[PDB]
Design an enzyme around this catalytic site. Structure first.
Site, mmCIF file in Angstrom:
data_model
loop_
_atom_site.group_PDB
_atom_site.id
_atom_site.type_symbol
_atom_site.label_atom_id
_atom_site.label_comp_id
_atom_site.label_asym_id
_atom_site.label_seq_id
_atom_site.Cartn_x
_atom_site.Cartn_y
_atom_site.Cartn_z
ATOM 1 N N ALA A 1 104.877 68.572 3.719
ATOM 2 C CA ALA A 1 103.666 68.499 4.523
ATOM 3 C C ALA A 1 102.881 67.235 4.178
ATOM 4 O O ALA A 1 102.933 66.737 3.052
ATOM 5 C CB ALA A 1 102.812 69.743 4.294
ATOM 6 N N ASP A 2 102.149 66.707 5.155
ATOM 7 C CA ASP A 2 101.263 65.565 4.931
ATOM 8 C C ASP A 2 99.837 66.119 4.976
ATOM 9 O O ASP A 2 99.633 67.317 5.189
ATOM 10 C CB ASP A 2 101.555 64.446 5.936
ATOM 11 C CG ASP A 2 101.070 64.762 7.338
ATOM 12 O OD1 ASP A 2 99.854 64.661 7.579
ATOM 13 O OD2 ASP A 2 101.911 65.107 8.196
ATOM 14 N N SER A 3 98.848 65.236 4.762
ATOM 15 C CA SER A 3 97.436 65.628 4.757
ATOM 16 C C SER A 3 97.015 66.522 5.930
ATOM 17 O O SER A 3 96.380 67.569 5.743
ATOM 18 C CB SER A 3 96.543 64.379 4.809
ATOM 19 O OG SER A 3 96.659 63.559 3.653
ATOM 20 N N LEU A 4 97.397 66.126 7.146
ATOM 21 C CA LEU A 4 97.095 66.945 8.318
ATOM 22 C C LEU A 4 97.708 68.315 8.095
ATOM 23 O O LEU A 4 97.018 69.337 8.155
ATOM 24 C CB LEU A 4 97.645 66.400 9.632
ATOM 25 C CG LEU A 4 97.734 67.552 10.653
ATOM 26 C CD1 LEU A 4 96.382 67.991 11.238
ATOM 27 C CD2 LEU A 4 98.827 67.312 11.702
ATOM 28 N N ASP A 5 99.014 68.339 7.842
ATOM 29 C CA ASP A 5 99.775 69.582 7.823
ATOM 30 C C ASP A 5 99.131 70.654 6.949
ATOM 31 O O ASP A 5 99.249 71.849 7.252
ATOM 32 C CB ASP A 5 101.191 69.266 7.356
ATOM 33 C CG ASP A 5 101.931 68.376 8.334
ATOM 34 O OD1 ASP A 5 101.654 68.464 9.552
ATOM 35 O OD2 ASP A 5 102.777 67.564 7.892
#
Lengths: 77, 120, 121, 122, 77, 77
Positions: free
Chosen positions: F34-38
């Protein structure tokens, strides 16, 4: 093949530039349009082909095709 | 003391499209005389123009009086970008008390990005 | 008292292509020994490598010889906040410029990573 | 004199997808009451929410952890159009604890991306 | 057509917005969704149509459709 | 069905990851990519499913699937 021909072939392949555009005087960034990455890929492709390791900031100072050919001729063992 | 901060991102293909539509008017508005002289003969004027545009927009925001035609970008002996101001741009810098200007630039296949900090 | 400023952006799929072409070569050049050890067992080494590359390039520009990406090492402190550890000629240059503090921020999206570094006395 | 540094990048269409899936929920977590009032009637709420999210993420990173909440600090524009931060509650108490004297914010948006950077300095 | 109609048509063309959306009170950035570029393309498109040059930060302050119509009426020769 | 199954379903759906990969020990950032948004999308999707609000910096410390299941079991009303 000669060192010049192999170096120019690899430069064209990595940078996506036509062979005729890869002149000895051509700058990778200023003449061949390389980015902060094509430096990486080109440097490492040449390091693999000729089995030699160059310090990073020395490769940053190699700005032209002729400079790369020169270093390869000077250091290949 | 940080006096100002600015950043920018530029989609290169978008710049190329603009050049396709209006020719050289973009470069004429953004570049100084020197930078225009360089642009006329560059191998990849799209990338050059994108990089200059990013840096100059970042500077304009950092100052937040600044005209694109009164300040140009140049590389010093270390290869690091540096700002040169004249006219009302330089007058504004002297008014704000700018002692140091810090610029950094990166560009990829599809994007250019730049950040400028002005400090006393 | 800002000594230097640097930024970088990295397209992740492009890194994936590089790894696809050259295996472990890129990580072997850019990463330090510790970072290489972490990379070897990392679940998503492409993303890890892209993020590290962004930080390291941003640092290199912030500093503006013989400076190698493998002489800049990234680690996470107790807060999860990134921090720089320097060896060799990188550390020598840092001591030369009078660097007292290093500030790093890093972000990544699905397609891009981006890092910014400020060095100050 | 820099106490902290933070940056963020936001893909706008991605925000569009998130809103398409969860409605106002994202805006209800990122925005303060005032900002949410503005969002409810905004003409292009996707771009507003994207930029505000970018700025606040940059600020949170700049503060680096006991707790910093999006609902205790809002973004506003001064007379020059320059973004500025307003803190209250435990966010403000944190700013006073760290000795924050000045906060510097910059924001940019493209068709596809909005990026923001925040520096906190004593 | 009138200066109003031509300016609104150009704004709609440049910004990709329907004509009915281009009201005189509408702001380019906050109401019509101009990102940081669309200022460039729109400013130079109006400068081209009406054969007038505006300083960058001066046209920069122009934030609404009515302000653009006003400047064009005031300066077009 | 169980809370475990529903939480894993939502995590897989949000992150675009196959179910078998969604193990209890897996970290959202370090194991599922996952990235920051996710983080946002996953946290808030679970908040929608189970009708509970978690503080943002409390959700930031939920780094693993098992921690999310734990919070949901602990706070769902």
């Amino acid at each position: 093949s000669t060192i010049e021909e192999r170096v120019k072939k690899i430069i064209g392949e990595q940078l996506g530039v036509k062979q005729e555009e890869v002149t000895n005087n051509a700058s990778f960034v200023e003449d061949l349009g390389a980015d902060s990455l094509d430096t990486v890929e080109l440097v490492m492709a040449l390091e693999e082909e000729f089995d030699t390791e160059i310090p990073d900031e020395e490769a940053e100072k190699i700005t032209t095709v002729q400079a790369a050919i020169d270093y390869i001729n000077g250091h290949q063992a | 003391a940080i006096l100002g901060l600015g950043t920018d991102i530029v989609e290169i293909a978008r710049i190329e499209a603009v050049i396709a539509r209006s020719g050289d008017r973009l470069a004429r508005r953004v570049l100084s005389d020197n930078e225009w002289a360089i642009w006329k003969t560059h191998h990849q004027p799209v990338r050059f123009l994108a990089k200059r545009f990013a840096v100059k927009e970042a500077a304009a925001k950092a100052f937040g009086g600044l005209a694109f035609n009164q300040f140009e970008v140049f590389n010093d002996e270390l290869g690091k970008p540096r700002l040169r101001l004249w006219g009302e741009a330089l007058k504004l810098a002297e008014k704000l008390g700018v002692a140091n200007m810090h610029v950094t630039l990166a560009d990829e296949r599809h994007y250019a990005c730049a950040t400028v900090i002005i400090e006393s």
